[PDB]
Design a protein around this ligand. Structure first.
Ligand SMILES: CCCCCCCC/C=C\CCCCCCCC(=O)O[C@@H](COC(=O)CCCCCCCCCCCCCCC)COP(=O)([O-])OCC[N+](C)(C)C
Ligand SMILES: CCCCCCCC/C=C\CCCCCCCC(=O)O[C@@H](COC(=O)CCCCCCCCCCCCCCC)COP(=O)([O-])OCC[N+](C)(C)C
Ligand SMILES: CCCCCCCC/C=C\CCCCCCCC(=O)O[C@@H](COC(=O)CCCCCCCCCCCCCCC)COP(=O)([O-])OCC[N+](C)(C)C
Ligand SMILES: CCCCCCCC/C=C\CCCCCCCC(=O)O[C@@H](COC(=O)CCCCCCCCCCCCCCC)COP(=O)([O-])OCC[N+](C)(C)C
Ligand SMILES: CCCCCCCC/C=C\CCCCCCCC(=O)O[C@@H](COC(=O)CCCCCCCCCCCCCCC)COP(=O)([O-])OCC[N+](C)(C)C
Ligand SMILES: CCCCCCCC/C=C\CCCCCCCC(=O)O[C@@H](COC(=O)CCCCCCCCCCCCCCC)COP(=O)([O-])OCC[N+](C)(C)C
Ligand SMILES: CC(C)CCC[C@@H](C)[C@H]1CC[C@H]2[C@@H]3CC=C4C[C@@H](O)CC[C@]4(C)[C@H]3CC[C@]12C
Ligand SMILES: CC(C)CCC[C@@H](C)[C@H]1CC[C@H]2[C@@H]3CC=C4C[C@@H](O)CC[C@]4(C)[C@H]3CC[C@]12C
Ligand SMILES: *[C@@H]1O[C@H](CO)[C@@H](O)[C@H](O)[C@H]1NC(C)=O
Ligand SMILES: *[C@@H]1O[C@H](CO)[C@@H](O)[C@H](O)[C@H]1NC(C)=O
Lengths: 578, 578
């Protein structure tokens, strides 16, 4: 029982974010401006989406719906809404506690299901369990109807605050929130679909079937395109602790909502089939991983309260959720399997990450080279770092196709890939040390040539030492055990020395105190990658038996080792002016 | 060998024009204005259409292409282009002979294939002959490449005329036309698809397959929606003989191009299979019936020459082609079949026309009633006419479901339907006589009440006479032979008296000489309907054996009898101000 067509998930994550990338490219170039994107959004939100919802609620089978999963998923969302509203009510400022308490729990519970979740669920669940596709169209509008009025009451209280007549008349406000919920196209189109499911007896009329198919099949691509068009220039800057609350909200939505969904599904679904329960638990975890829908930013726009935070949160959560679906789904499918074909799964995941990392690295390198900022510090060491990560990805490109052909080509590919990887490891520390030296503003001529010589020679010297002294393992198909324990000891020493050098330089920068505003976080986000890289090397030497936690840590080593170009591109390449 | 899934053609004609109607409604209301429709068109023409063409040219099988059909279809288009260019060069005015000679043959040869032709061909030809769907993507870009440069040379000569330096340098102009052809997205996307068909060996890569499917499946609905958005307010008014040349161009494109396509396919396809030849001939006729693409109006816009005529021609040809596909395809499938189930085909066609006629009549009646113009002449008799045609359509609605239930209900339905039909027949003449009386501007108090009494009583008296004197035919399932020869004699006398009364009034109006500008043509277009109605009644009495020409004439009787509400709605209901 595979219960997940996980082979065909990466093409789905390529479609759903390639159309978003196309919309973003068309928005920033200047092909479709904001006003014309408003017309495309008018088409999508008023013609394609109601036809999709109406068709899929007409043909829906209410006899075969496992309701236990449905109200378990809703109990999870209700708990998330309740806790986020509770601490947003306690800790926020009195002049804006009600707007935040009405918009943040809406932000932390409303997934982007009809645009992004439906193609991903369709790819993972058409050929194995086709009945899970209807739960999107069942759960998302019920979640809207049962969670949005509570938030809208608070935002209408905040709108009441400015006027301030102490009118009372609670009907006037809570019925206003309720009718705002009912005027949403999803809600009354699901009501109409529920009525016509019983009127027409679960069958769309033949004269109307093709019209509804033509309007519903145009929702996916145009909706993803309009979502990509929505993100142009909306990230803005922020303020201290607004960064922190943005981290907390996106962390809540993408982390504690899926674990609550899994826990309440494992608590409330009491079926007699274990494999069905396991597939329901995995699908419940996958459902919460979907990003925040743009309807929350629309709601904050019509209320005209906290528009910057919610818009930044949606455009940040959509990007951030893109690797989280892949990593989470491959972590869910790692139970059972088999010991030895797990290595091919790890290799396939690293290959699929390296494709996107190489393309984004080519983009960021082209932007940095054409803008002529590569000659000025500190961007020269960054250019060296991105070149090294490109050699890492190209080494995986070679290594996937040459592991079973020749020993000499495999040895050369391993030497090049680990030289580039170790160079990236110490290049993070070299960039941090250069940032600490430039932050002191002293008259010290920084030897950038000597730094580049060290960054190109020390990993090469380590690779040569591992080639001269290490013993080749012919039965090892994974890259992490090419020379056995000698290679892992060399990677552990390089990671520990680089993290300690970068950690001292990062702590010295705060005590001594674009450019430095983003540079630090790109240095910061790699240290979490190097910390997870160091722990798996420590886990292998001290423990003889590799457990399942070692499997998860090796997978995280693959993502934070081979997707560093993605993080670098998100920080550096996606930026204007240059 | 049916060779046409003609049962499922009307849902396809409902989808392809319902999305166009949705786009038109959204454009005129004010939901999506012109500027925002430009952004939706930017998405459709730059992202969805190139992905559709690139995918369908990647997976195309060049081993199984019957090339004989392809260059027969191209020879037909070349002949149409040659003759239209020849007489446009002879008869046009010298100051604008080159612009017309370069834009009119482009107008008369460029079908709307990727938006409208592809779903209709998909419905008619997926389950029977699936290999005909690739001929759209093969023929339309080759037709573009082989016909557009000849026109573009003439339009660039007209652009040269205003500057007038007598530069010569024929390379400078014909290469400009050629590069304008190559910069069209269809042409170089078909070139790239041709290259990648041989590079990738006819298979789209798996990482790119879902992305291309997501962008290509969004072309149909959004393209039809943008086509509907394009038509808002573009019909304008016209000038004498511009009406005539518009009739000639749309007549050429929708009439003589399909007969030339059939004749050259029957002349050039010399295969050894008769049924394949017949299906190819029918598909070749169906291919030319597609309306003019909006790219011709785009081309006239970028040239900024004859924009009004070409825009009016495209928005007129798209509406006019909507019944022509249905009538033409049912005329093509009428060979062979069987004698007696031909009556069910006729009944099904009349039912499918009556659905659209009833909905459009409800719209036009609501517009005429709410605008309060029904109380003033001549619109009162028009309101009576549309009410009578609504009773005709509702009588067919009753008659389809009550022909095999009870004799009394069938008799009542036949009496009501033929009373309303005969009332429509003489109401055309009454409207013409009232127009002739109002055109005289004399002080004659027109008895509108007596006219309404005559229009409601004379058809009722004819129905009562046919009930009292006629003999019921129990073996007749068609409506035209309910009382045998007595009913057809009564319909012939009513049609001959009405055409003679309206013909005298129409000829007297021209000799004596919105409002009268459109009123006459709605009176004019019904006379062609009454003339075709009269000839089939004359054909049945004088000829004992019903031939195939009688079958075609009875079918035309059904369309011009039961779709008069469509013509009335197109003239009256689709109008502003009111
Ligand atoms: C657990 C972490 C949760 C909560 C701890 C949050 C810590 C960081 C935010 C507080 C920063 C701050 O000082 O805010 C200030 C302004 O701040 C702003 O400008 C907006 C932030 C206020 C609302 C934060 C909502 C948190 C939602 C959380 C949802 C996360 C999801 C949970 C699941 C992962 C106002 O706050 P204050 O000055 O402290 O208030 C003054 C009153 N006092 C003096 C009496 C104290
Ligand atoms: C793996 C592959 C998956 C498939 C992908 C397929 C390929 C598709 C790839 C990508 C698709 C995503 C959309 C494409 C277009 C981008 C638009 C966008 O939203 O950009 C936003 C940028 O966003 C940021 O600036 C956020 C930075 C996040 C980087 C760090 C996150 C690490 C994720 C891992 C952590 C967990 C690791 C795992 C642990 C479990 C908004 O852009 P903007 O508003 O224009 O702002 C920029 C300009 N300005 C700054 C000058 C104003
Ligand atoms: C197989 C899987 C691989 C895919 C994985 C995807 C992952 C990698 C994802 C993304 C990397 C590439 C996309 C970058 C996104 C930002 C682009 C952008 O807006 O920049 C520029 C357009 O630039 C273009 O036109 C880009 C062309 C596309 C590159 C690929 C082909 C904008 O130019 P500007 O000067 O800023 O505009 C100023 C406005 N002005 C022109 C009106 C003055
Ligand atoms: C067969 C019917 C075909 C041809 C006969 C066409 C008859 C009606 C059009 C002529 C009207 C007219 O007088 O035009 C005038 C202005 O007219 C305009 O304003 C524009 C019309 C001129 C170009 C018409 C292109 C016809 C394409 C047809 C494609 C149809 C498709 C064929 C297949 C069905 C100019 O024309 P003129 O005044 O006559 O010219 C003066 C020169 N002379 C004095 C020496 C004569
Ligand atoms: C059978 C059922 C098929 C399926 C249909 C499914 C249902 C879908 C139905 C219809 C779909 C069509 C599009 C819907 C929206 C209309 C938009 C449009 O183009 O309107 C245009 C109007 O056009 C006219 O004014 C033309 C008048 C033609 C009427 C006579 C043709 C008779 C056809 C039979 C002859 C052959 C008989 C057969 C012999 C072989 C442009 O509109 P506008 O620019 O806004 O101008 C109006 C306003 N203004 C005047 C004030 C400026
Ligand atoms: C089963 C098969 C059946 C289907 C067969 C289809 C065949 C029958 C086809 C068409 C008949 C119906 C469509 C009419 C087309 C024109 C509509 C239009 O633009 O008018 C009005 C909108 O009007 C609406 O909003 C119409 C609502 C749809 C009616 C059906 C539900 C426009 O109103 P206005 O006052 O002109 O706008 C002025 C602008 N202002 C508001 C900014 C001031
Ligand atoms: C488990 C996940 C979902 C929670 C943490 C996700 C991380 C990677 C997200 C959440 C908060 C996000 C950051 C917070 C806000 C900004 C400010 C802006 O100027 C650039 C993007 C940037 C720097 C975001 C980058 C990505 C980010 C750090
Ligand atoms: C066989 C077919 C394709 C050829 C003739 C089609 C007929 C029905 C078409 C072609 C020319 C068209 C007319 C010519 C131009 C106008 C002027 C405009 O103010 C209203 C529409 C109207 C009145 C068109 C109505 C439909 C029309 C009469
Ligand atoms: C889930 O449902 C039942 C048990 O509840 C059983 O047929 C099997 O475990 C699963 N069936 C399907 C069709 O998923
Ligand atoms: C058309 O092709 C051949 C004859 O050329 C024959 O198999 C049959 O008539 C048709 N076949 C198909 C698959 O349409």
């Amino acid at each position: 029982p595979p219960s997940m067509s996980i082979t065909r998930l990466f093409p789905a994550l390529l479609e759903c974010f390639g159309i978003v990338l196309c919309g973003y490219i068309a928005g920033r170039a200047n092909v479709i401006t904001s006003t014309q994107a408003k017309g495309l959004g008018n088409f999508v939100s008023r013609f394609a989406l109601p036809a999709l919802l109406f068709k899929n609620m007409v043909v829906l089978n209410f006899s075969n719906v496992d309701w236990s999963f449905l109200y378990s998923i809703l109990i999870a969302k209700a708990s998330v809404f309740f806790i986020v509203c509770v601490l947003t009510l306690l800790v926020a400022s009195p002049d804006s506690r009600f707007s935040k308490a009405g918009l943040f729990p809406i932000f932390a519970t409303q997934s982007n299901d009809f645009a992004l979740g439906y193609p991903i669920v369709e790819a993972l669940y058409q050929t194995t369990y086709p009945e899970y596709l209807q739960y999107i169209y069942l759960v998302a509008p019920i979640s809207l109807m049962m969670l949005n009025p509570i938030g809208f009451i608070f935002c209408e209280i905040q709108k009441w605050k400015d006027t301030q007549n102490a009118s009372q008349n609670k009907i006037k406000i809570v019925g206003l929130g309720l009718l705002r919920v009912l005027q949403n196209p999803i809600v009354f189109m699901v009501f109409i679909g529920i009525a016509f499911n019983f009127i027409l007896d679960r069958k769309v009329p033949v004269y109307v079937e093709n019209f509804l198919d033509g309007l519903g099949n145009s929702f996916s691509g145009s909706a993803l395109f309009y979502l990509g068009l929505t993100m142009v220039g909306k990230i803005k800057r922020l303020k201290k602790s607004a960064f922190v609350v943005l981290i907390l909200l996106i962390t809540a939505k993408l982390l504690v909502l899926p674990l609550l969904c899994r826990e309440m599904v494992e608590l409330l679904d009491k079926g007699d089939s274990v494999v069905n329960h396991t597939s329901l638990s995995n699908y419940a975890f996958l459902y919460g991983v979907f990003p925040v829908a743009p309807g929350v930013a629309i709601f904050a726009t019509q209320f005209n309260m906290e528009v910057e935070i919610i818009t930044s949160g949606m455009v940040i959560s959509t990007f951030v959720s893109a690797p989280i679906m892949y990593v989470s789904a491959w972590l869910l499918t790692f139970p059972t399997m088999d010991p030895k074909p797990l290595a091919y799964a790890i290799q396939n995941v690293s290959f699929d990450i390296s494709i996107v990392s190489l393309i984004s690295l080519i983009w960021s390198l082209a932007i940095l080279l054409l803008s002529k900022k590569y000659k000025q510090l500190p961007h020269m060491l960054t250019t060296n770092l991105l070149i090294a990560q490109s050699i890492v990805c190209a080494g995986m490109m070679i290594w996937n196709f040459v592991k079973e052909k020749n020993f000499v080509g495999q040895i050369l590919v391993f030497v090049l890939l680990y030289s580039s990887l170790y160079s990236t490891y110490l290049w993070t520390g070299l960039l941090a040390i250069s940032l600490f030296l430039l932050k002191k503003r002293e008259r010290v001529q920084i030897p950038v040539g000597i730094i580049i010589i060290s960054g190109w020679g020390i990993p090469a010297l380590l690779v040569g030492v591992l080639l001269i002294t290490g013993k080749h393992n012919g039965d090892s198909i994974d890259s992490a055990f090419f020379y056995g324990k000698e290679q892992m000891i060399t990677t552990a020493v390089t990671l520990f020395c680089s993290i300690l050098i970068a950690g001292i330089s990062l702590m010295c920068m705060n005590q001594t105190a674009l450019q430095l505003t983003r540079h630090v976080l790109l240095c910061l986000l790699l240290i979490i990658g190097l910390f997870a890289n160091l722990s798996s090397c420590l886990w292998w030497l001290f423990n003889q038996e590799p457990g399942r936690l070692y499997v998860e840590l090796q997978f995280f080593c693959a993502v934070f080792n081979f997707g560093q170009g993605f993080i670098s591109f998100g920080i550096f390449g996606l930026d204007k002016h240059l």
